[PDB]
Design an enzyme around this catalytic site. Structure first.
Site, short mmCIF file in Angstrom:
data_model
loop_
_atom_site.label_atom_id
_atom_site.label_comp_id
_atom_site.label_asym_id
_atom_site.label_seq_id
_atom_site.Cartn_x
_atom_site.Cartn_y
_atom_site.Cartn_z
CB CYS A 103 32.63 -28.66 10.09
SG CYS A 103 33.37 -28.04 8.54
CG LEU A 104 33.00 -22.61 13.88
CD1 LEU A 104 31.81 -22.04 13.12
CD2 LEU A 104 32.73 -22.68 15.37
#
Lengths: 148, 93
Positions: free
Chosen positions: A86-87
């Site tokens: 999750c970036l």
């Protein structure tokens, strides 16, 4: 093949002067398919670790971000059992100004500063918010088991 | 055409690199690591004692000792032609 050309450019620049914390190139002859390693930063519990990442560039790069999964196990709020990350900059902050280097570096920053309020693994996000010293301890350990 | 040459510089945790150095495709990674332990610069918070303590990485792959530079070649491994940068990671075990 704007995509190819731009990917090729990013490779060329990277190979001239790679970020100190990461290494990446195409796996074989498909140049949309790279692999890379992230060196766990000193200023994180993942110090000393080497983490394997795969990279798939989409056909309309650079207008859409690359796909990036960890292959090496990590204890991290924003990376799950299947190495999904999750970036921010793979989502709403992607810009075509960005490069795979810049992406790889962000993943470093993520190791040193996780975002528990955007979790992919709630036990770890919770442990992090609630009991940081234990998160710190836990990889570390997973860094030794799985990244060394 | 089995024993050709390439130039490597070695990127360190610091950001500093050492090299460039000329080697042949026939050189082993094992060799390359020894060269690293040897030319290790002074005044680092870390120093590799031996060869068993250094990992080398090139184009996203961790290179294994008993392979040779020539077999650690990928089609896209040196687009420019020139110096290849490799990454050294020092793991006390």
């Amino acid at each position: 093949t704007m995509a190819s050309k731009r990917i090729l450019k990013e490779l060329k620049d990277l190979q001239k002067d790679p970020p100190t914390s990461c290494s990446a190139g195409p796996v074989a002859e498909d140049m949309f398919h790279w692999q890379a390693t992230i060196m766990g930063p000193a200023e994180s519990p993942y110090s000393g670790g080497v983490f394997l990442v795969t990279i798939h560039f989409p056909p309309d790069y650079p207008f859409k971000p690359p796909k990036v999964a960890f292959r090496t196990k990590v204890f991290h709020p924003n990376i799950n059992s299947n190495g999904s990350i999750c970036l921010d900059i793979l989502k709403e902050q992607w810009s075509p100004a960005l490069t795979i280097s810049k992406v790889l570096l962000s993943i470093c920053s993520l190791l040193t500063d996780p975002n528990p309020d955007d979790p992919l693994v709630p036990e770890i996000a919770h442990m992090y918010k609630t009991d940081r010293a234990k998160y710190e301890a836990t990889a570390r350990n997973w860094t030794q088991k799985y990244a060394m | 055409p089995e024993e050709e040459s390439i130039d490597i510089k070695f990127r360190l945790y610091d950001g500093s690199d050492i090299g460039p150095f000329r080697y042949s495709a026939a050189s082993t990674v094992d060799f390359l690591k020894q060269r690293v332990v040897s030319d290790w610069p002074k005044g680092k918070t870390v120093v590799p004692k031996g060869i068993n303590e250094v990992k080398l990485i090139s184009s996203g792959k961790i290179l294994e000792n008993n392979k040779t530079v020539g077999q650690c070649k990928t089609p896209f491994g040196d687009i420019a032609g020139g110096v290849i940068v490799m990454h050294v990671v020092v793991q006390p075990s």
